[PDB]
Design a protein around this motif. Structure first.
Motif, PDB file in Angstrom:
ATOM      1  N   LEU A   1      64.558 -11.695  93.858  1.00 25.89           N
ATOM      2  CA  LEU A   1      65.706 -11.158  93.189  1.00 25.89           C
ATOM      3  C   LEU A   1      66.918 -12.050  93.427  1.00 25.89           C
ATOM      4  O   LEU A   1      67.666 -12.416  92.512  1.00 25.89           O
ATOM      5  CB  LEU A   1      65.933  -9.743  93.708  1.00 25.89           C
ATOM      6  N   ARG A   2      67.092 -12.434  94.681  1.00 26.52           N
ATOM      7  CA  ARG A   2      68.154 -13.332  95.056  1.00 26.52           C
ATOM      8  C   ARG A   2      68.056 -14.585  94.188  1.00 26.52           C
ATOM      9  O   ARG A   2      68.905 -14.896  93.355  1.00 26.52           O
ATOM     10  CB  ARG A   2      67.853 -13.770  96.475  1.00 26.52           C
TER      11      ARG A   2
ATOM     12  N   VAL B   1      71.404  -8.574  89.418  1.00 26.18           N
ATOM     13  CA  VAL B   1      70.445  -9.539  88.937  1.00 26.18           C
ATOM     14  C   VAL B   1      70.444  -9.530  87.409  1.00 26.18           C
ATOM     15  O   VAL B   1      70.706 -10.541  86.770  1.00 26.18           O
ATOM     16  CB  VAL B   1      69.081  -9.179  89.479  1.00 26.18           C
ATOM     17  N   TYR B   2      70.174  -8.352  86.841  1.00 25.42           N
ATOM     18  CA  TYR B   2      70.127  -8.145  85.412  1.00 25.42           C
ATOM     19  C   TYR B   2      71.304  -8.794  84.721  1.00 25.42           C
ATOM     20  O   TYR B   2      71.139  -9.701  83.882  1.00 25.42           O
ATOM     21  CB  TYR B   2      70.158  -6.641  85.124  1.00 25.42           C
TER      22      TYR B   2
ATOM     23  N   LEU C   1      69.426  -4.351  91.403  1.00 25.43           N
ATOM     24  CA  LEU C   1      68.976  -5.099  90.250  1.00 25.43           C
ATOM     25  C   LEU C   1      70.030  -5.269  89.238  1.00 25.43           C
ATOM     26  O   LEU C   1      69.974  -6.221  88.458  1.00 25.43           O
ATOM     27  CB  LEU C   1      67.729  -4.556  89.559  1.00 25.43           C
TER      28      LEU C   1
ATOM     29  N   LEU D   1      66.338 -15.254  91.672  1.00 26.11           N
ATOM     30  CA  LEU D   1      66.487 -15.045  90.251  1.00 26.11           C
ATOM     31  C   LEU D   1      67.973 -15.100  89.948  1.00 26.11           C
ATOM     32  O   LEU D   1      68.411 -15.783  89.009  1.00 26.11           O
ATOM     33  CB  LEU D   1      65.892 -13.701  89.743  1.00 26.11           C
ATOM     34  N   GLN D   2      68.750 -14.399  90.790  1.00 26.28           N
ATOM     35  CA  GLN D   2      70.196 -14.350  90.606  1.00 26.28           C
ATOM     36  C   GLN D   2      70.859 -15.725  90.605  1.00 26.28           C
ATOM     37  O   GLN D   2      71.747 -15.987  89.796  1.00 26.28           O
ATOM     38  CB  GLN D   2      70.877 -13.379  91.580  1.00 26.28           C
TER      39      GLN D   2
END
Length: 164
Positions: free
Chosen positions: A118-119, A87-88, A84, A121-122
């Motif tokens: 997550l991907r 991502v964060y 994460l 989002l990235q």
């Protein structure tokens, strides 16, 4: 709006032990106590947290400090996390809270399993991330909150928290 406010909005505040969305014992601003069915288990846990014999009830003040700690633990968790952290790092201010929110509610691990989302989002494929997130046990067990979070991820604004 900050991540703190957002959370405070989603979890609210109670000064007496209570049961959460999955029937677990919590207090204050959604601070989880035990998953055990025992309420003695809960007071005990709470007493230890607080530094005193609470008999199950605490102060606004104590709740707030637990909150702060609780928040701290989430971010820390996001950061120690190989999945994460990246991502964060790539999130903007607002979505960043969304992720924190997610982590506060279910834990690093749980959140870390949102592999594809997550991907996306990235990559900033919001609408896509959103769809994907909706298809989760998370989304199933807490629809209202999910929507808010997800919506945040989607828009990157605080429109879903408009009425908080």
């Amino acid at each position: 709006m900050n991540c703190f406010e957002m959370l405070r909005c989603d979890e609210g505040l109670r000064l007496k032990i209570y049961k959460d969305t999955e029937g677990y014992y919590t207090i204050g601003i959604g601070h989880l106590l035990t998953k055990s069915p025992s309420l003695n288990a809960a007071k005990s846990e709470l007493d230890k947290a607080i530094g005193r014999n609470t008999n199950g009830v605490i102060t606004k003040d104590e709740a707030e400090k637990l909150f702060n700690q609780d928040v701290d633990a989430a971010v820390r968790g996001i950061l120690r996390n190989a999945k994460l952290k990246p991502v964060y790092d790539s999130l903007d201010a607002v979505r960043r809270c969304a992720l924190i929110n997610m982590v506060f509610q279910m834990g690093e691990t749980g959140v870390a399993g949102f592999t594809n989302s997550l991907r996306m989002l990235q990559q900033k494929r919001w609408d896509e991330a959103a769809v994907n997130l909706a298809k989760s046990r998370w989304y199933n067990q807490t629809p209202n909150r999910a929507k808010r979070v997800i919506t945040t991820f989607r828009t990157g604004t605080w429109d879903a928290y408009k009425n908080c």
